[model samples]
Target chain A: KLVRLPGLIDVHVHLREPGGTHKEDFASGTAAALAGGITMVCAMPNTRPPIIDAPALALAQKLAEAGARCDFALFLGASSENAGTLGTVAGSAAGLKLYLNETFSELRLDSVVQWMEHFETWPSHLPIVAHAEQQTVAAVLMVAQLTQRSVHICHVARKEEILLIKAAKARGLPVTCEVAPHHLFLSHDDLERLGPGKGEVRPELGSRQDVEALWENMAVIDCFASDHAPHTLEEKCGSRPPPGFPGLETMLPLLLTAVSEGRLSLDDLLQRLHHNPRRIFHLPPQEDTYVEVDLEHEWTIPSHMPFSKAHWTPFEGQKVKGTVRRVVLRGEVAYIDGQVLVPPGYGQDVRKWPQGAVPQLPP
Target chain B: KLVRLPGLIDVHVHLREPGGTHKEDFASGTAAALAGGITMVCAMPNTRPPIIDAPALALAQKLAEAGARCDFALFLGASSENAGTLGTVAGSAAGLKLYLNETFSELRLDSVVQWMEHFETWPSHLPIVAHAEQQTVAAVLMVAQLTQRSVHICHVARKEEILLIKAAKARGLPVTCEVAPHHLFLSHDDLERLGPGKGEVRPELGSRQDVEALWENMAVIDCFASDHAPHTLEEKCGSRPPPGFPGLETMLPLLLTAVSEGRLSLDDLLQRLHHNPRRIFHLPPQEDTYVEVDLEHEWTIPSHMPFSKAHWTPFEGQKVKGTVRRVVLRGEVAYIDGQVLVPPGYGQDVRKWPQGAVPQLPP
Candidate 1:
C-alpha cells in the first residue's frame, strides 16, 4: 500500500523563462517543483519582460507550455504604468499581483489616487494578491475599503499583520492571506546561519515572536505558498542583495514535518496547500495527481540540488523529516524516488474555476 | 582590596524633575543612579519647563543640587525657538541635546538650513550630543560638513551607523559616538522573549545579526551611554507605550556579565562609562566616589527595584552574572547591597574642564 497524499500545490514560484534566464527558466523551475512533490506552482510576473501586457502574459503561458515539466500558471503583475493593461486581461490571468512597494521590479505605487482608482473597477473574478508588511497590507486594506474589493495577502510574517488581517477578515471584507514557509521556519536566528544579507527576503524575515504569531494565528491565515524566489549565488552574495530565496522544493516537506511533529494537523495542511489556494486562484482539484511521502524519514537539505537554475537554497544545511517519495502530475509519474520521470510540458496548465465562482470546502 | 574601577558615570538620564516629576524626580532619579553604582548621571532637557534658556537651565541645576543623591549635570536643549538660548548657555551646559526627532515636548528640528546655520558658530567648547538613528546621525554629519563642527552621536544602534561614525572619525571631522547597553544586549529575539512590541525601545531593538555586529565592532565604537529614558508603569503598559525604559540601574551589571562571558574587558567598560562621557561632557573624576561589585554573583533582575519613580525596568527577570555591592559618593557610602543609604542633596555637581580643556587620556 502506498502512503499517499494529494500532491502539494505551491502558489508561488518565479520561473524566469522570458527575461533573466541566467537565474532560472521554466524548464528548471517546474522540474524543481515536481521533484519536491509540488504538482503545480503559480509564477510571479516581475520578469525582464514583466508579464504586464496581454502579449507578454500570453508569451509566459506559451513558454510554460513549451518548457514547464510540471503544471505552471502566471500572475499578471500590476504596476504604476500597467493599470490599463491589468484591466484588459484581468480575467485570463491567474490573478493580479500588485507590488505596492518596490521589489524585484519597480512595482511601486506612484500615488494614492491612482491606487484607489485602479481598484475601483478591479475585476472581481481574478483575486488580487499582495506582498506582505503591516504597512502595505494597511494600504491595500485602505484601498479595498474605498473600492470595496477583496484582496488576498501573501507571505504574511508578523503577529501584528496576522491580527490586522484577522480584523479585516472579521469585518467580512473578503480578505484572505497566505504565510510563506520561510517565515514560519526561519527568523533572525537563521540570519546568522545563512550569513547576513544572504538570508534576506521580501517583507523581510520577522523576529522569532513574529514566526510564532504566524503559527499561533494559522486559523486566521487562509493558506500557504513557497514564494519561490530564486537568484544565482553570485547575485545574492553582492552588496545590494536582491530580496528572496528559493522555496518550491522545500515548502511541502517542511509542512509535512510540521504535521508529523503535531505542530499542525495533516488535513489542515492539505487544505492550506490545496483547497484554499485552489479557491483564491480559481484552481481546480487534482483528481489525477498525488504524491507519496515517508513521514518518518529524516534528511538534510542537499547543498547542490534541485531543478531550479539558481543553484542555492536558504534551507541549505538544515535537517528535517517527512520526505516526499513520489509525485504524479496529470496521472503521469513526474517524479519518483527523488528523481524526475517526466520530460518538459508533460504537465498541463492548472484547471481554473469559472470566473466569479467561489470554491467549495473540501468534503 | 576590592575591585575598584572608575565609578560608572551614565551620560544619559531623564530626571524628569522640572516637570513629569510624577515619572521621576531628581531625588529618586539620582538615588537610582547611585544605587546602581553610578557616580554621576547627565540629565536631559526634554522635561516640562525644559532646560532651554539660562534661567531654566540654572533652575534645574539649583533643583538637582538641592535634591540629588548623586552628582548630576544637564544638557541645555536646542530647538528652533530656543536657538538664541542655546548660544547663551552653550558654555555652561553639557553640550546641546537636540531632539532631531520627536520625543518629549515636540522637540523637533523645524528646518535643515536653520539647524546647520545655528551651528556655524556653535560653541567649540561645548560639544553637541545627539539621539540615535542613521538618518539623524547623517543629518548631523551633513550639518557638520556644512558648518565644519564636531558632533557626538548618541546611542548608535546599527552597524551602518557605527561605520558612518567610523568614517567620520577617520576623516578627522570631530565625530564621536556612544552605544547604549540596550542596543548591545537586547534585540528582536528578546522582544519575542518578552512579547512582541513589548520588547520595543526607541531606535527599536534590531535583528540578531545587528546586535552581533554591534558586539563585533566595539573597537571602532567610541564609548557607551544608557539613553536611560524612563516612564511610569502605567505609561509603559498603556496602549501607546512610550519609547525607552530604565537603563541607569542595569547598564553596568549587564556589562559586567558581558565581561564574565569574555565579551569585553572591564577597563573598556570603565572607559566607556566614565572616561568617554567625561571627555565628551568634560567632567572631572570625583576623588571620593567609587563603587565595588561581586563579579561572580549571578542574580535575576528584581521586579520592584530601582530608585527611579517609574519603578520599572525592561531588564526585569533577565539573568546576569555580576551584581553591584556598594556605591560611594563624596567619601560616603551611597548604596550597599540593594539599599540606598545616602540622604538627598549629598551629591555634588560634576566639575567641568575649563572652556576648552581637552581631556587627557587616563595615564
Candidate 2:
C-alpha cells in the first residue's frame, strides 16, 4: 500500500540523448529519475541535432523505448528554420517547444511568434512550452493573450517574472509555470559559496530579496521540474561548460526538505510534483505507480553518487530531511530502499494528450 | 602652474589612533593619504575608549599634529552613554558621528535627534557626518530635516538610500552624501568573486542595476570618501573580519579610471573630490597644494602596496589609465613619484568652524 502520495510527473527534464549521449543518455537519466521517485518526465528537445522534425522525435521515442527505465514524453523544437516541420512534429509529439532565449537550438520570440500563427491552424491540440526569458513582460503577455493556447513556462528563476506568471494565471489564461529545484534552494549567497565555477544556468542566482519574493508567492507555481541538464565533471570544469546541476536524483529529497522545514507544505509539494503536472500535460494517472516517503527521515547527500555520468550537484553534502524509500511503477518495484530494482528496459513511452480536449484560443 | 586639480578631501578615514595600532596607526594611514594626493581627511571616533569627550578630542588633535603626514580633522562620537559629554566634544570637532546601526557604538533616532538639538545650539557650526545605511535613512533624514544642520552622509551603497539622499538634497536641505569607491566599483558580482569575506559589509553590495543607478546619479553626490576601515590580513581572513577595503591610495586613481572610461567626467571628479568637500566642511584651501595626474598614462595596481599597515585593496591588479604622480601640501612636496615625502610630522590638525560662521537657527 502507498504510504504517501502518487508518483511525481516532472514535465521538464533534459534526458540528453541521440547526440549528447556521453553527458546523460536516456537509460541512466531515467534510472536516476526512478531512484528519485519521479514516474514521468517530458524530455526537452535541445540536443545536438534538435528534435525539430518528425524523424528526430521518432528516433528519441525509439531510444526511450529501448532503454528508458521510467515513463517519458518528448517536446518538439519549434524554430523559424523548422517552422514547416512544426505541424508534423506537433501532430506526433507532446507539445511545441518555443525557446524565448537562444539556448541549444531554440530561437528568439520574433522567430517563434510565426509558429503561433501556424499552431493556430494545426489540427492537433499540442501545448506550447516556452523558455520564457528573452521576451519582455509586455511581449510575453501579448503572446499569451494572443495565442490563447495552453502555454507552459520553462524554468522560472526571477521573482518579478514569477509575479507576472501569477497575474497571467489569475486572468485564467492557459498559462502554467515550472520552477527548478536550484531556483528554490540556491541564491546569490550560494554564488559566493560556490565561487567562480558556480555551475551554469541563466537568470543567474538572484538576490536574497528576490529569493524571498519567490518563496512568498510559491503557492501559484504549477509544478516543479528538474531541468537536469547534466555534464561530466571534466566537461563541467572545461573552459565553457554549461551552467546547471544534476537534479533528477535530488529533486524529491530537496522538496521534501523544504516541506519539513515549513517553507512549503506536503500538499503544495504534491501538487507541484504530481497533480498539477498530470493535469497540465494531460497525462492519465496510473493507480499502480506511486512513491512512499517518510517526512521525518533525514539524510546527507553525497557527491559523485548520481547514476548519470555527470557526477556534480550543487546540493552536494547538504543534509536534507524527509526521504523516499520506495517507488513502484506498473505493478513492479522500480526503485526500492535507495536502489533501482528494475533493470534498463522496463520504462514506457509517455502518451500525448488526445485531440479535441484543448482550450479555446485567447484574443 | 598646476596642470591638474586640487587634492581630494576624504571625510571618513580611520587612522587607528590610541588602539589597534598594529593594524594601522595615524602615521602610516596619512602617509598613504599623501601618496594618494588626499589633502585632508576626517578620522572616525570608534577607537580605544572612543572619542566621545573633549579630552579625547584634544588627544586626537595632538596625535594628528605629532603623527599625521597630511592635514586632517576628527568626528566626535555621539551615543546615549556619552550624551553628557556630547556638547563638549561637539564644540571641538568638525562633526558629530552617530552609529545608527551596529557599530563601535549605537544610538537610536530619539537620542540622535536630541544630540542634533545640542549640536545645533553650539556657538560654532558643525556638520554631522552620519554613517548612513539601510537602518539609518529614516533617523538621519528626520534629524537632518528637523535640525536643518549640514549633514554629510557616509558610505552611500544601496540605491534606495542614494535616491532618498538625492530627494533630500533637492529640498534644499543642508544635506550631502559621500560614495565609497567600493560602492561604485564593486557590486554583488564581487561577492561572487571574493566570497563570504567580501559579502560581509553592512548595507552589503547591491545588484548591478543598483550600481548602475548610483552611476547614473553620480552628479548629485557631493564628496567621495573611503570608509577605509582597515584590518590586518590575519584579522581580515580570520573567523570574522568586517567587510571593508583599504581605499585611501586607490580612491583618486579609481575615480580617474571612471572618468577615463566615461562613467564620470574629470570636472565631476574634481567637484566631488576637492570643491564640494572643502565647501561642505568649510575648509580653507591650501593655495600651494595640488595633485598632478596624467589622464592618458596607464598602470596596474599592486596588492598590499598601501603605506598603511593593513595591506589589502579591493582594486588590486586592476589596470587603470589615469595615474597620480605628485602631491604638494603647504608649499612642500609631501608625496612624489609614488613615495611619501612628508615624514609623518609635517601634517596639521584642522579645527571646527569658528564662531559666526555657523548657520543660524531657523525662526
Candidate 3:
C-alpha cells in the first residue's frame, strides 16, 4: 500500500559543517534527511569551533545555505560567556541549545547558576533546546520553572526521566522533550552485538525496561528526533570511538517497523515527526512538501548508508517493512527512488522562509 | 455523624526540638498532632543543629522519647560529609532528608555531584526524603534513578513539580511525593490577605492555577504532609520573618473543608493522610489506634492553635466542617475534647516499635 505524509521534521541532528565536514557536511546530512523522508532538520551546534558566536553561526549557516538539499536551521550553542549576547543572533538560529549534560562538545554546563543565567537571559519567544539526561532533565525543568520559560529537552532515554517530563507536562510547565529512534529501538542488550566501542551513544543506551517505558509513555513525547550525530566509520570503530550513530537515514524505517507491529500508531508517528516539531520549534509551513512511502516494501539497512558521509549505521542488517519512494520539498522533487534530485544550495533556511522572499519554484 | 478513621500520618513536619523549643518541641508538636487527629508525625531534620550525625539524631530521638505525646519518627539530614556514614544510624532515623532547595536551614545542596553521593550512599531500603523544589525535584528523581533507590519528595507545591512526581511514579520509579495543605488551599492571590511576611513559605505560594493543579492531580499525590514547620507569632511577624506555618493543627480541617465542598473524595483523603504514608515510610502498625471525627460539625480555625507553641495559624478564622473529637493511641484514649490526655514520654518511636517490646497499654 502507498501512503503520503507531510514532509517529516527531525528537530535534532548534527550536520558537522564549517569543521569536521569530512565526517558529514550540510549536503550529505540533508540529502540523508530527504532520503529517509525528512524535509527539514534542525542542526546541532557542536562543530569544531562550536556555533556559540555570530561568526560560528554565520559559518554554519553559510555552509548549509550552499550545500543543504533539505530545509534547515542551525542551533546557537549556549555558554557561560554568551548569556548576555545570545539574543544578538536569536533571529538566525533555531533555538539556544544548552548542553547541561555530557555530549561530544565542550559545552556541558556544570552549575545550576549558569543554567539559571541562560534560562533567564535567553530570548523567551524562542525555545531553549537542552541536551539534558536523567538528573539534568529534572534540573533543566526546574530552571525552566524558575525562569518561567519553555525548554525543549533532547534525546530523553531513561524511564524515570521521560516519566518526569510527562508529569511536568501534565502540570502545565512550558516544557517539551524528544526521544531518538535509537533510544526506542536500541538498548544495553544490543551493545555487545554492536561491538565494544561501536555501540557507544550519549545518554547511553538504557535497559529493555527503559525502552518499554519510552514506548509506553510515547504520548508524552513531543517529537521524534533522529539525534542524527554522524561520525566516520574509522572514528566509530577506533580505540577512542566518539559516541553517536548515523541516524538520519534509518529513523523512519525502524519507527515504521514498530508501527507495522502495532506498537505505535500511524497518527502518533505523524504527530511526532511532523506536527509537534513544527509547532514546538515554530517552523514555517512547507508548501507542497510531502513524502511518498510504499508501506509494503521491505529491505535491510545496508552496512553503509546511502547519502550520509559517515557511510554506516548501527542499524545495519536490520530488516524493515517500509520504504520512502520520494520526497517533495518546496513544490519540487527533492528525493526519488534512492536518489537526491535537489542539488546543494536548493534548501532554504526555514526561518528566512517564514519572513518571505521564497525563490518561486517552476510549476 | 462521628466517623472513625485510621490515624493520619504527616510524613513531613518540623518539631523544632533540641534547639528551638520556644517555637515548638516534641510535647507541643505531638499534642498538636493528636488534636489534629494525626497519630504519627515524621519530624524533619532542619533543626537548630540540623540532624546530620549520630549525636544530633540521638539528641532528637531522646527529646521525642521524653516529650512527645503521639507516635513519631525523626529524619536524618544528608550532607556532603556524611554520605559514607549515614548507614551507621539508618536504623534510628526514618530516612535521609536532603534539602536540595532553600528551606529555613543551611543544608541546601548546591552541587549535583553531592546529590549523587547522597543518592549512592544513603541506605537504599530506607527512602531518601527530599525538600526538592521544581528543578531539584527533577534532579533528585534522576539521582534516584541512577542509584536505583526510592525517594520521598517533601512538600511538593508547584503544578510542574507534582506532575513530574506523578510521571516518576507512573514510570515505576521507587519515588513518592507529598503535598502540604497550604499549597492546596492557598496561592499567590492569598498572599495579600495573609499579610506580607505571614504568608511566607518554603517553595513559596504558587498561582491559583497551581492550586487548581494540585487539586486536579490529587490521585498522583501520595501523602498530605502538613510540612508543619511551626514558629511563634512573635518570630513569624518579626523582621526577617521565617518561612513556615503552624500546620500541625490546621491540616485536617482545611482538607476536610475541601472534602465537604466535594472537591476531594473521602477515599483520597484516607489514602494520602493515612494509608500511603504508612506504606511509603514503612511505619509500624499502631494497634487499636484511630481518630474519632464529628464529620458534620463546623467550627472556625481559632487564631491561636490550641496545643501548638506557635500560637497563630495561617488558616486562622477559616470555618471548616469535620472536627476531631477523640484520638486513641495504642488502645488508649490519648486526646479528647481538644485536650491531650497523654503526658510527656507517651509517644513512642515508630522505628523502635517495629523491632521490640512496647509496654502494653492499660486496658
Candidate 4:
C-alpha cells in the first residue's frame, strides 16, 4: 500500500511567477512538486522582476509563502555588470543564478571574460548556480581554479560537459553540477530512435554519448533538477524552442523506473534527489517531508492534465515504472493519490542557506 | 633550462597502421610521441581491420614493437556485435575499447539497450575503453552498474559528460575518463579565434561549457590524451574532412601553459598526463623514463613541422607557453630540443597488469 523515502529536492526549477504566471506560478509549481514527490524546490529566478537583489528575492519569497503548496526557496540572479554584487549574496535566497547565455531569460554572459570574472567574484561556500551550456561552463571552471567559491552548473545535457566537469574535479576544483529529467530521459539518441525534434528540450537533448555519460558518471553529478521551465508545446514548436520542460512530476517516476530497470539504485535516487542537493545548498532535514510510492505502479505517461498552464508533454506514449502515492510537505499532506490534498499558500520559504541555514518557515 | 618531470603518457592516440599507413604508421606515430615527451602511448584500434581478437591484437603489437620509439599498449575494438569477443583480449593489447555511436572505428552500440547488454558480457577486472560521447555515455554507466567490468570513457568533450561521469563514480560505477587537448583548448568559443573546423576531433570539439567542465571537474577526469588522429592535409582539406586532428607534439605544452596561467596546476597535469594513465592501464611506473620541460619558454605552434604524415594542425599559430626540452624513453633519451635522439624500434610492449590478466586466446 505504500513506500517510504525522504521527500526530494529539485535544485533547478522555474516557477513562472510575478511575470510569466500564465505559464506557471508558485501555486501550480509547488503542487506539481508535491505530486512529483518533491516536498521542496529551489526555483530559478527567471520570473518577473527576477530575483536580482534583496527586494526582488523577498518578493519571490512572499509570493511562494502566499501561493505555494510545498516548501520552496528562490534563487537570486547575477549578470556581468553585477559581479561585485555576487562576490557576496543575500541570506534569503539559496544561491546566485547566472544565465550564462541567452535562453528564455534576458540575463546572460555574452563574453567568456564576462562570466569568468563574474564567477571569480562569488565567495566560497555560496554556490553560484550557472545556467551555462557547454561554452560558459568551460569558462566558469577555468575561473573556478582562481576562486575559492563553489559553483553549481545547471542543465548539463552533453557528454563532453560531464567529462569537462570530471576533469575539473580531478584537479580539485570547486564545482557541483546537475542534470534535468529531459536530459536523462529524453535525448538525441531518443530523437534518432523516434525522430529528430522528437525528444527535444532546452540546451538541446544530449547525444547518446552524453546521455550514457550521465548514467555512467552519476557519482560526480551533484543533483537531479527538473529545470522545470514549463513552456507550452506551441512555444517549443515555434521557430526557436525557448527551452526547458515540465519535470517536477515526471522526474522521479522516470528515475524510479530506471532504478527498477537497474539503471540506478535507490541510494542514487536519495543521493541525487535529496542528500546531495541538501548538502550543496545546506538544507536542513525536514522530518515532515517524505513521500510514498508504489513500485508496482508501471505506467505510461499521458498529458493527464498537467499542473502547469503549458499542459502538454511529448513523452505521452513512453512507458515508465513506479508511481507517486502520496507526499507530505512540511508536516502537511500536500498530495495523495490523484488529488492535491493541501491548498495553495500552505507552502513557505524553505531557504536553508546563505549566511546560515534557517528552519523551514511554518505554513 | 630544464625541469624534471614524470614520464609523460598519452593515453589516447591513433596509429593508423595495419591499413591507413598513408596517414600515419606506428613508426611515425611513436616518433611523434617521443618528440612530444611521451614515454608511452596507448593506441586506438580504429585500424584498417580493427583489433577485435587475439590475432589482430597480436599483429598490432608486433607492428608497434617493430616500429615505435616509445613504449605502447593497444586497445582492441569492441562492439555489441562482438561483445563476447571483448571478454578475451591478448596480452599484446591493454583492454577492450568500444566506439559508442560513431567514431573512427565502425564499432559502436546502436541502441542504449543494445550496448548495455553487451557491457554485461565483459568479464570483471578487464577495463573497457569507450569512445562514447554525450548520447551513449549515460547508457554505458547504467550498464556499468550491472557489470563489474570497468569502463574508461574516451575523448570527453563536454561539461555534461563530466557531470555524468562524476555521478557514475559517485555511485561507485567502475569507470574513468579522458579529455583531449582539442576539446580543452579549442572549442565552440574559440571557433572564431581558431577556425570553424579548428579542433574538429570526433566526439567533436566542445563549446565553452564543455571545455570549462573539463577543468571544473578535473578530479574525476582520469587522463589526458592526444586523440591525435593524423590525416594528411590533403585528406582534411578534401570535400569531406574526416574527423580528427593532431595534438601529440602540443598536448603537453598546451597543458603546461594552462598550468602557468593557473588554469591547471603542475599536480593536475602530472596526474592527468602520467599517474592516472598508468594506473588505468596498469602500466608500471617508469622512473627511468621522464621528460624535461622549460616553463619559461613560450612558443607558437607551427604546422610547417609535424612528426606524423598529417603534417598540419589547426592549432597552428596558436600562442603557447612552456617547451618540452627533452624526453627519455626506457632510460634512453628519445628527443631533446628539436632533435630526435632515439631511433624507431626502441619501444617495447608495455603491459603491467594484463600479463596474468590475459584471457584465453582463440584459434
TM-score of the second chain, each candidate in turn, equals: 0.93, 0.90, 0.95, 0.91
Note the DockQ of each predicted structure: 0.01, 0.01, 0.11, 0.03
Q: Fill in the DockQ of model 2.
A: 0.01
- TM-score of the second chain, cand. 4: 0.91
Better model by lDDT, 1 or 2?
1
Number of the top TM-score candidate = 3
What would the per-residue lDDT of candidate 2 be over residues B1-363, giving only the tens digit for each residue? Answer: 224668678888888887778868889999888877798888988888578778877888888788888888787877665655565456456677766666433344333434444445533366777775742553455444434456677888876667656655655656688888888888887776566764466557778977887898887788888887777777767787775678888888888888878887888988888888877876656758888887787889887765878887667767887767888898998887778888777877666424313344653
Each candidate: RMSD to true structure?
21.4, 14.2, 15.1, 10.7
Question: Residue B222 error for model 3, in Å?
Answer: 0.8
* Tens-digit lDDT string for candidate 3 (B1-363): 688999889888899998899998899899999999999988988888889999888888889999999988898988768877877678677778888766698587645657767876766667678888766777776566555677888888887787767756655667788899889888888787788788888989889978888888888888889988888888878998999988888889888888889998889899999889878877777889999988788888778888889888888778888889999999899999888898989999888864422222343
State residue B289's C-alpha deviation in candidate 2, in Å: 60
Clashing pairs in 1: none
Candidate 1, residues B127-181: lDDT per residue as tens digits?
Answer: 7887636445655665554455678887878766676566556556687888888
The top-ranked prediction according to lDDT is 3
lDDT of prediction 3 = 0.84
Residue range A32-134, candidate 4, lDDT tens digits: 8888888888888888787776677768777888888887778888764676674334556777788866677847755544554555565545667887665
lDDT of 4 at A198: 30
Q: Per-candidate TM vs. native?
A: 0.52, 0.49, 0.57, 0.53
